[PDB]
Amino acid sequence: DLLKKEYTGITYISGPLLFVENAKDLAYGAIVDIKDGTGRVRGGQVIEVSEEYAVIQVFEETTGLDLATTSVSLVEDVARLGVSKEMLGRRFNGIGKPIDGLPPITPEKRLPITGLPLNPVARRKPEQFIQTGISTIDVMNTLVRGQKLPIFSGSGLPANEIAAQIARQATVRPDLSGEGEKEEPFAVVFAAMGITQRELSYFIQEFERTGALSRSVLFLNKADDPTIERILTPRMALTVAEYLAFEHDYHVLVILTDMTNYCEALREIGAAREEIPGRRGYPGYMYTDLATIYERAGVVEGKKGSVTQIPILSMPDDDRTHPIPDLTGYITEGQIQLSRELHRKGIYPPIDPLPSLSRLMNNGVGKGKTREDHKQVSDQLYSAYANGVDIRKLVAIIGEDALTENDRRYLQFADAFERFFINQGQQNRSIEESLQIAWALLSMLPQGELKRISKDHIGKYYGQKLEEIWG
């Protein structure tokens, strides 16, 4: 209603937590306004309520607050976001306020940002093949519409350029799939958490040059912004994405810049409240908290729209067994892992195919979708590359001159594979070009060693030469 209720009587302020005693009328999970003695208003959220006292976490910094003049007032019982179709082309901060100088959005609905779980009966299988233009992804780790495919990166590796290239080059192929239906371009929902100015200025220029800002909604939480605001931002972005996808039949692509910062923000609050930790001090419920973010993608039966997620996260000390990559890989449908060793040699994009994985590959490839020899070629490349890597390891112990011809063939295959298939630069490749290059590489090996490829496909496609394409 028009009424608002005031709460004085704060008894404890320290770090990100604030304590108020006679506040039994505050619902659990409600949003509050904290008013300073100078009139400044800061946000908050109730995380524990009792008839004795209540606990409120503060989004902004606690500078200038005091126990004599501060007051707390209720905003709403459930955290909600006002969403509209007018949001396309606007920029917002980490809590949904405009920062582009334009008037605020006139809401059409007010949706809870925590969301609701999708019914497993209401889902359907994602099967539409998406062509990203990168041979290491399209052929060996195929991405389909409705998948969660995070990128596992290091400290100095170019994950942002790969994400921008994917967003620039992604398209479906109606002619191969037989649908015949053209598409409108993807709408991009961009959520940044703790991003620096150097990366943000690159992303803004990349989106400006390709003309994608007219179809994009941006949520920006910079590195000098308060830390606790990072809890809200993925939920706001995914709420807007879900509304656009399942209410107006858009095809939404979601990019989350750094989940490591989100996990650090979660760990700070968890250690403030003294939860029981998991590995390396992170709270024990981090698997559940991450699950409510990733599981908001997919495809819904009877609806045209879809949500696709590309989270980006940095592995500390390039460790795959850190809790953040481990709990991320236990939820998502695969990952794309970059290699620092490939980056040192000048290969771009430095995607390492052995640790990479795509679970939904079998649905969107095969006869009548891309081509009948996709999966067997993908498997044969993996086996041959693994043998080449093992021979590389053995050479370092026994020396190169002791190799037989069979091992030298695999060594040269691995070298040519790295120098030609992975290393492609900024060029855009169709799936047919990638398959042609892959078949050209496999022609170096003897015909009798192609165990995983059927003999009819071998008779149909074997016998190419790589040098004719470039010379």
Residues 399-428 close enough to bind other proteins by CB under 8 A: 402, 404
Q: Tell me which stretch binds other proteins (CB under 8 A): 116-124, 202-210, 221-229, 413-421.
A: 116-124
Of residues 146-165, which lie at the interface with other proteins (CB under 8 A)?
Answer: 155-156
Q: Which residues pair with 171 in a beta bridge?
A: 131
- Cβ atoms 169, 196 nearer than 8 A: no
Residue type, 398: I
Nearest of 77, 48, 62 to residue 13 by alpha carbon: 62
* φ and ψ of 242, to 5 deg: -65, -40
State the minimum distance, in angstroms, from the CB of residue 439 to other proteins: 19
State the minimum distance, in angstroms, from the CB of residue 66 to other proteins: 5
State the minimum distance, in angstroms, from the CB of residue 51 to other proteins: 5
Residue indicated by tokens 């693994």: 386
Strands 357-358 and 298-299: unpaired
Q: Tell me which stretch binds other proteins (CB under 8 A): 112-120, 128-136, 184-192, 227-235.
A: 112-120
For residue 245, the Cα-to-chain-centroid distance in whole angstroms is: 17
How far is Cα 98 from Cα 77, in angstroms, rounded to an integer? 23
Q: Does 119 bind other proteins (CB under 8 A)?
A: yes
How far is Cα 93 from Cα 195, in angstroms, rounded to an integer? 12
State the minimum distance, in angstroms, from the CB of residue 218 to other proteins: 26
Buried b (16+ CB within 10 A) or exposed e, 185-200: ebbbbbbbbbbeeeeb
State the minimum distance, in angstroms, from the CB of residue 62 to other proteins: 5
Q: Tell me which stretch binds other proteins (CB under 8 A): 202-210, 250-258, 355-363, 419-427.
A: 355-363
- Cβ atoms 41, 35 nearer than 8 A: yes
Of residues 287-306, which lie at the interface with other proteins (CB under 8 A)?
Answer: 287-288, 291-292, 295-296, 298, 300
Site string (158-197) toward other proteins, x via CB under 8 A: ----------------------------------------
Q: Does 333 bind other proteins (CB under 8 A)?
A: yes
Q: Does 85 bind other proteins (CB under 8 A)?
A: no
Three-class DSSP category at 187: strand
Q: Does 214 bind other proteins (CB under 8 A)?
A: no
Q: Choose which of 386, 416, 444, 466 interacts with other proteins (CB under 8 A).
A: 386
Q: Does 75 bind other proteins (CB under 8 A)?
A: no
Residue type, 358: S
Q: Choose which of 161, 275, 372, 418 interacts with other proteins (CB under 8 A).
A: 275
How far is Cα 106 from Cα 87, in angstroms, rounded to an integer? 10
Nearer to other proteins, 101 or 448 (CB): 448
State the minimum distance, in angstroms, from the CB of residue 420 to other proteins: 21
Q: Choose which of 95, 176, 394, 416 interacts with other proteins (CB under 8 A).
A: 394
How far is Cα 51 from Cα 42, in angstroms, rounded to an integer? 24
Q: Choose which of 121, 184, 346, 401 interacts with other proteins (CB under 8 A).
A: 121
Q: Choose which of 118, 223, 271, 416 interacts with other proteins (CB under 8 A).
A: 118
State the minimum distance, in angstroms, from the CB of residue 97 to other proteins: 19
3-state secondary structure 285-324: CHHHHHHHHHCCCEEECCCCCEEEEEEEEECHHHCCCCHH
Q: Does 238 bind other proteins (CB under 8 A)?
A: no
Q: Choose which of 198, 276, 317, 425 interacts with other proteins (CB under 8 A).
A: 276
* φ and ψ of 132, to 5 deg: -95, -10
Q: Choose which of 66, 179, 249, 341 interacts with other proteins (CB under 8 A).
A: 66
DSSP per residue, 325-389: HHHHHTTSSEEEEB-HHHHHTT-SS-B-TTT-EETTHHHH-STTTT-TTHHHHHHHHHHHHHHHH
State the minimum distance, in angstroms, from the CB of residue 223 to other proteins: 29
Of residues 12-41, which lie at the interface with other proteins (CB under 8 A)?
Answer: 12-16, 24-29
Counting other chains too, the contacts that 409-413 makes at CB distance below 8 Å and 24 or more residues apart are 409/444, 409/445, 409/446, 410/384, 410/445, 412/444, 413/384, 413/385, 413/388, 413/441, 413/444, 413/445
How far is Cα 329 from Cα 332, in angstroms, rounded to an integer? 5
Q: Which residues pair with 91 in a beta bridge?
A: 218
Q: Does 446 bind other proteins (CB under 8 A)?
A: no
State the minimum distance, in angstroms, from the CB of residue 145 to other proteins: 13
State the minimum distance, in angstroms, from the CB of residue 399 to other proteins: 9
How far is Cα 14 from Cα 17, in angstroms, rounded to an integer? 6
Q: Does 354 bind other proteins (CB under 8 A)?
A: yes
Q: Does 277 bind other proteins (CB under 8 A)?
A: yes
State the minimum distance, in angstroms, from the CB of residue 426 to other proteins: 29
State the minimum distance, in angstroms, from the CB of residue 206 to other proteins: 31
Nearer to other proteins, 117 or 425 (CB): 117
Nearer to other proteins, 226 or 298 (CB): 298
